[PDB]
Amino acid sequence: PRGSMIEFDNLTYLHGKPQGTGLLKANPEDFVVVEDLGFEPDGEGEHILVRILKNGCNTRFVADALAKFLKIHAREVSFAGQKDKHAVTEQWLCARVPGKEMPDLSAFQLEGCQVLEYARHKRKLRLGALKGNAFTLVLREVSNRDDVEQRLIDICVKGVPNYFGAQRFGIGGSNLQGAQRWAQTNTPVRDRNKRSFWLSAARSALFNQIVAERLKKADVNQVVDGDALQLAGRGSWFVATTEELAELQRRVNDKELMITAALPGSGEWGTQREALAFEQAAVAAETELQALLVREKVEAARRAMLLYPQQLSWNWWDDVTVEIRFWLPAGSFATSVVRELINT
Amino acid sequence: HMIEFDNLTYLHGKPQGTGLLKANPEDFVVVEDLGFEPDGEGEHILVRILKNGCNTRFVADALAKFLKIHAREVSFAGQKDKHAVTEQWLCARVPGKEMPDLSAFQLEGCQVLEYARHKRKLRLGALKGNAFTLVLREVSNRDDVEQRLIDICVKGVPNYFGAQRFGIGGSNLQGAQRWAQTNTPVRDRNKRSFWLSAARSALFNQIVAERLKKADVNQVVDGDALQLAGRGSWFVATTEELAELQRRVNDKELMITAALPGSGEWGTQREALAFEQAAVAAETELQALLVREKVEAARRAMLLYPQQLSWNWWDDVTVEIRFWLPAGSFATSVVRELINTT
């Protein structure tokens, strides 16, 4: 059975493959993540926002525990996003518990999880409904400090490819594999979760591939006729035209606009003419995955090709250990930044 | 050439899901708001009628018959078509103080809800606004819709003129463009209005689309024409006042406007005016047509904040949404930012 599609480790680099190695997440304390909702709990509402700090367990696990403690169905507990199990993460959970009474969540004890705050909120917390995350990482046993230092400087200026991290395609890549097999047939998928995982890996893999192809051009950030340019910090995007190229390039160079790559699916991809031809050619061989996404009615969307870590700063503890801090928008991965610093 | 409707910039970005709007007339309920209660005296009789399956003019002629008066004695502030359910007000001139029994007036598909005398005649465009109740069906991405409804509560939507403004098949804009290329006058007065209206509306939509491409959409600039919320009055922003003006705009007390090109001054000045002119610089022919026909330039809020926006999800693929919009604003403009339709 001949397999596929550019593999993750073969994805193009913006600053070239690093000339050094290092350790990522040697200890959970070396990977701290603080969720950034973008809003404060209202202080009223039928929902209860619970801010927790965890270590050594996934979000759903703590969510199920929270549900049990409040004597409510696991379905009554949601969250903004999945936080790494092997790391120190802080995030919000949301449980629907209507009423004027506020349950004593300070009694909720669970190994590898500390409650830090809880208050009522009107609307339920939905997946993907967060602003971003603040990261504090420590890279250990850095074999080439000068290479890493130089890369951190270049990242501050040019950024890094906004790839979906390896964690997006399932353990061992099962999600992408399963998505591929399912696309080779017409056998519908029962399990709602198994279906979402697969559809997500498919579109994510295609996005990464389009970006990897675009990075093979002479000028990676060159705006071309028909590009879908997204305003920095938000979803709104528009189509570029030959007539406006000069001014558009300036905004893109100034990081006001973001060249985007397609997130394949039903409907139109967004790009037009030249740019559209490019994206279609970049994944021309993936007719099967493309067709799968279309039949499952997963609307095509736009995603920034590049990623500019915010408030990027770093400190070297010694010639082989660095602490790095930065904030990333929702949907971007810290591993996409680290990929351009060291090889793991 | 000119930005096409479907390519008009989105405030919240193009939706990542689809759905059905107005599957049946019952999924689109529009309740007219006069902006006042009838005087309860006067030579005119205001009649509120629930309409489903026929248009205004039709019901108006039917009322005229029932009351034994000239069809042109029945007026109305806003026209509406069959495809939607509308609680509309009709105005009949019946001098005197006696109140005819509008309980015998039974037209197919209609229902008289109330009636009272009033002093002034009801005129087209005199409506203050409309309250809508819509049912979006076969929603493919609830999460997307939910977040967009929430974002709209905070930021609103672009106050675009809906497609209906450009005639069936876009014929009104087409007619305006063909007309703009010749000095030939236009016979039919109805054609004149529809065409001039489509041209100015298209220009406004393009200016807003351009403005939405800026880093900060609601950023006030020197020379901007700011309109007081709820009314037509507007004034020009000045550099020395920006911080204060910006606060009132963020607080939704003032509305940044975009031009409705026509004869006379557009309203904006300096920077803002230069921006608006460039935004439609290539539309010289349509502009000259408006100037030529003496259609006075005017102002229209760039953004639209649906009032009392609330919604209820029947199931994962069905939502009933309610909101009030001032006259001149479109429900389709709110929906454009929620789902993609065909």
Swiss-Prot record, chain B:
It catalyses: uridine(13) in tRNA = pseudouridine(13) in tRNA. The active site is at 32 (proton acceptor), 81 (nucleophile). Changing residue 88 to E: 3-fold decrease in activity. SUPFAM superfamilies: Pseudouridine synthase. Residues 156-304 form the TRUD domain. GO terms for cellular component: cytosol. It is an enzyme of class 5 (isomerase). GO terms for biological process: pseudouridine synthesis; tRNA pseudouridine synthesis. Changing residue 32 to D: 3-fold decrease in activity. Responsible for synthesis of pseudouridine from uracil-13 in transfer RNAs. Belongs to the pseudouridine synthase TruD family. This is tRNA pseudouridine synthase D. It comes from Escherichia coli (strain K12).
